[PDB]
Amino acid sequence: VLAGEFSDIQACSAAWKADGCSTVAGSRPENVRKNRYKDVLPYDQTRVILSLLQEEGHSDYINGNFIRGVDGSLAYIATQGPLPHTLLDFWRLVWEFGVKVILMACREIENGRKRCERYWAQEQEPLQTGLFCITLIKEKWLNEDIMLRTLKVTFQKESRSVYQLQYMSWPDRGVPSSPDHMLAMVEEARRLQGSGPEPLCVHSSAGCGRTGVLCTVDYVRQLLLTQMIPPDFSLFDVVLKMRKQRPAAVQTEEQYRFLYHTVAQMFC
C-alpha cells in the first residue's frame, strides 16, 4: 500500500521531468561546478535566487529551493551541503533571507567521502568566508545525537545570531538513529525560530531525502499545532508537493514509510 503510494509518487516525478519542472539555471556552464552532484539540480520554478552583492557581479545561483509551509508562506529553504567554493554562497543565502535556524541532517564525512563542508565555528577559531565573519558563541548537545551551535555572523558592520542544529547519526536513504531525537530537533528549531516569517534553512548532503523528511515532519507538526486538519488531508499529497519543489524530497520508500509512522504517531 505504502509501497504502491511511493511508487506512484516516483511515477509523477518522472513525468514532470519528461514534460519539462525545469533546470536551466543549474545547467548553465557558469553554475555546473556549484552542484555537489550532477544528478541533483534545483528546479527553476522554486529555486533560491541570491541578490546579495548583486552590484559586485556575484552570481544568483545556489543549489537550493524554497518549499512552502502550512500557511502557504516560503517556510523552508532546502539546499545541499555547501562545497569548499560555495561556502560564501551559503552564507549569502542565510543572510539575504534572514535565516535564524539551520538544520543539518548529515555529517562532513559519510562512507569515507566528503559530504558537506564545515561552514560554522569553531571554539576560539572564527571562520572568514569572503565578507562574512562567523564566530562560535557557544555549543552544546541538545541530546546525544544533536549538537546545537550558537553562531555570531558578521557582514558589512551588522551582526546577527544564527543557530545550527546538526543531527549526527542519520544515513542518507535511511532513517534517523533515534526518531524521538529527530522530533526534539524540530521542536527546538521551532523554539529558536520563535515568531517571525523567516524560512528555516534545512540541508543534508544533496539536500534531498533527509532534508525532505525534516521539512515534511515540521510541516505536519505545524499543521497539527496551528491549523484545522483538512478532512481530506493526505500524506501522499504533501510529499508529492514537496517533491515538486525540491527534487527527491523524500527519496526512498523506507523514508516514506518512516514519515507515515511518524505522522500517525504525531496525530496520535
Partner: peptide, 7 residues
Amino acid sequence: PEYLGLD
C-alpha cells in the same frame, strides 16, 4: 558523482 543512482 551521482546521489540518486538507485532512486
